[PDB]
Ligand binder design. Structure first.
Ligand SMILES: Nc1ncnc2c1ncn2[C@@H]1O[C@H](COP(=O)(O)O)[C@@H](O)[C@H]1O
Ligand SMILES: Nc1ncnc2c1ncn2[C@@H]1O[C@H](COP(=O)(O)O)[C@@H](O)[C@H]1O
Ligand SMILES: [Zn+2]
Ligand SMILES: [Zn+2]
Lengths: 299, 296
C-alpha cells in the first residue's frame, strides 16, 4: 500500500480510470482556498486568463511538445466522416464491434500545461513594453501517465504565473517567485526542499535533454516528501524557457530581441493532497496559522 | 451576431472556434453564478466535482454514442513502444502525419456533468427512501464548432441530479422548475420555459427529437440572446426514466430500477446571458443583481 492511499476515501471517488477521480466537497473546498491564497500573492499589473481543458493542436505542435513529451499527450479524436460512415460505426458498436476504427484526430488536444496558450496571445499584441508582461493562468491539464498514486494523476489543475520579457525580467521574476513560493509552503506548514530539476523528456534523446536542462539550471522544483523523503513529490516548478517561446511565436522584447519566458507552476491537486497528507482530513485540527491563511476561522 | 461585441472584454482567441481563454471579468461572474447556484443546494445533497474527462466505457454504456456520435470528443494517445513513438515524431519532422500512431484511450471528454454519477450511486447498493441527490460539475465538451459566443465546444456545466422512485424525480423536477425560474428572475434575465428536444444526429435522430418533445422528457429555460425568435437554452430539466437505473443496476428502496432526472445549468451560457443583458460594466448592474452575486 502507498502512504497516500488512506486519503482516497475522504477525498476522491473512483471514475473507473486510474488518475481520474471525482473530488469530494472537502477536497474541492481546500483546492479553492489554495487557489484564493495563490491569487492574494498576484503582483500588480498581472493579467489573469482562464483556459479551458483543450487547446489548439497546431499551437501545441508548433510549441515543440511532440518532440519533448509525445507519450504524455492526449489528443482529441472524433467521428468526422459522412452520415453513412458515422451510422456504420454506431451500428458496429451495436453489434459488439469496435466503433473507434472510425475515429480521426480533431484540431484540438487536451492541454498538457496551463501556460502554452498564453505565448501566441502575447505574440499577437506586438512588441513587449519595458519590464515585459506578466500573466496569471490556470487550466485543467492532461498528461497520459496512468497511475494508482494519488500524487500522479492524468487530469489535474495547474495554476501558473508567467513572465514574458528580457532575460533580466524573467530571471528577476523567477528569483522573486522561488522566495515567495517557499514562504507560501512554509506558511502552509509543509515540509519541503527546493532542488535542481528536469522535465520528463521522452526516450533516449530525452535522457540527454534532461541532463542538459538540469545542468543549465532551467528548472527548479519545490519537493515535498509524501511517500518518502528519498522520493519527494514536485508540487511547484520554477521554469526558465530562455527564448524557446519568444523564437517560436515571434515575441520581441524591449531590446528588440526574441523574448525570454519563465513560469512559476503550482500543481493544485498535488498541493491539496500534500495538505491532507500533512495535516489530516479533519480541518478543525489544522494549525491555527494554516487555517487563518486559508480563510477558515483560525481558532 | 448580436453577441459578437462581448467577445473583446470576455474572451481571447485560442485559435479554434468555440474554444476561448476567459478574462478575469468573465470568470469572476461564472464563479459568482456558481456560488449563487450553491446557495440553492437542498439539505442532504452530495457535491461531487468531476474532471473534464470520464471513462469511455461508462459513456458507451450510457447510450450517448447511439444518440450524438458526431458530438463526442474521445481521448487518443501514442500508446506504442518507444521505437514506434520516436518514428511517429520523426514522420512529423519529415512533413508527414504523426497521428497515424494514435489509438483510443479508455477516456472521453465528458459531454455532460452527470454521466459519472450513476455508476458511483450504483456502487453504494440499494437507495434509501427519498432517493439520492447530487450536486455535480464538470468542464464539458461537444464537438460542434461555431463562431457564436453561446455555442461553445468546451463549456462548464453544473447540475443537480435526483436518483430514486418516479415520485422522488417528479417532486425534484417540480421543485427545480420553480427554483430555476426564481434564480433567472432574481438575475434580471428575460426568459420563457418551454418543451424541448436534444440534437439527435441524422434522419433517425430528427424523429427521436420529435418523440422527445411530444413526451415531456425535456424542459428548457430559454433566454433571447441573438433574437426572441431563436432564444438560447441556458438551463434544462431532463427526465431519463429508468435508463440509468437499468444500465447501472441502481435499485430504489422498493427494489425496483431507479428513475433519474437532472437540472442542468449552462454556466457559460448564463454568464454570456448576464453580460448581454446587463452589459460589461459591473458597477452599472442593478443593485439586487449585484447583491445576490455578492458584488455589493
Ligand atoms: N501527473 C501529475 N499529477 C498531478 N500534478 C501534476 C502531474 N504532473 C505535473 N503536476 C503538477 O503540475 C506542476 C507543473 O508541472 P511541470 O510542467 O511538470 O513542471 C508540477 O510541479 C506538479 O505539481
Ligand atoms: N455548445 C454549448 N455551448 C455552451 N453551453 C452549452 C452548449 N451545449 C449545452 N450548453 C449548456 O448546457 C446546458 C445543458 O446542456 P444539454 O444537456 O444539451 O441540455 C444547456 O442548458 C446549455 O446552457
Ligand atoms: Zn508554464
Ligand atoms: Zn444531467
Amino acid at each position: 500500500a502507498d502512504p497516500l492511499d488512506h486519503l482516497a476515501d475522504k477525498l476522491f471517488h473512483s471514475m473507473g480510470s486510474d488518475g481520474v477521480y471525482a473530488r469530494t466537497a472537502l477536497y474541492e473546498s481546500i483546492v479553492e482556498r489554495l487557489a484564493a491564497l495563490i491569487t492574494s500573492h498576484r503582483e500588480a499589473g498581472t493579467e489573469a486568463l482562464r483556459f479551458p481543458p483543450v487547446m489548439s493542436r497546431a499551437q501545441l505542435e508548433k510549441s515543440g511538445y511532440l518532440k519533448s513529451f509525445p507519450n504524455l499527450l492526449g489528443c482529441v479524436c472524433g467521428l468526422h466522416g459522412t452520415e453513412r460512415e458515422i451510422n456504420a460505426a454506431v451500428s458496429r458498436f451495436d453489434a459488439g464491434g469496435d466503433w473507434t476504427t472510425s475515429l480521426s484526430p480533431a484540431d484540438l488536444v487536451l492541454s498538457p500545461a496551463a501556460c502554452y496558450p498564453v505565448y501566441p496571445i502575447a505574440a499577437s499584441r506586438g512588441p513587449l513594453p519595458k519590464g515585459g508582461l506578466r500573466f496569471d493562468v490556470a487550466a485543467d491539464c492532461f498528461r497520459r501517465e496512468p497511475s494508482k498514486h494519488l500524487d500522479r494523476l492524468q487530469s489535474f489543475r495547474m495554476r501558473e504565473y508567467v513572465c514574458i520579457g528580457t532575460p533580466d525580467d524573467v530571471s528577476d521574476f523567477r528569483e522573486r517567485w522561488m522566495v515567495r513560493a517557499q514562504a507560501i509552503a512554509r506558511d502552509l506548514g509543509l515540509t519541503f526542499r527546493v532542488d535542481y530539476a528536469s522535465d520528463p523528456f521522452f526516450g533516449r534523446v530525452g535522457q540527454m535533454k534532461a541532463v542538459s536542462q538540469k545542468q543549465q539550471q532551467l528548472k527548479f522544483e519545490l519537493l515535498i516528501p509524501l511517500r518518502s523523503e528519498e522520493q519527494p513529490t514536485a508540487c511547484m516548478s520554477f521554469n526558465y524557457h530562455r527564448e524557446h517561446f519568444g523564437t517560436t511565436w515571434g515575441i520581441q522584447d524591449a531590446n528588440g530581441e526574441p523574448a525570454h519566458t519563465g513560469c512559476v507552476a503550482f500543481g493544485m491537486d498535488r498541493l491539496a493532497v500534500a495538505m491532507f497528507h500533512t495535516h489530516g482530513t479533519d480541518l478543525s485540527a489544522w494549525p491555527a496559522k494554516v487555517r487563518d491563511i486559508l480563510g477558515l476561522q483560525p481558532h
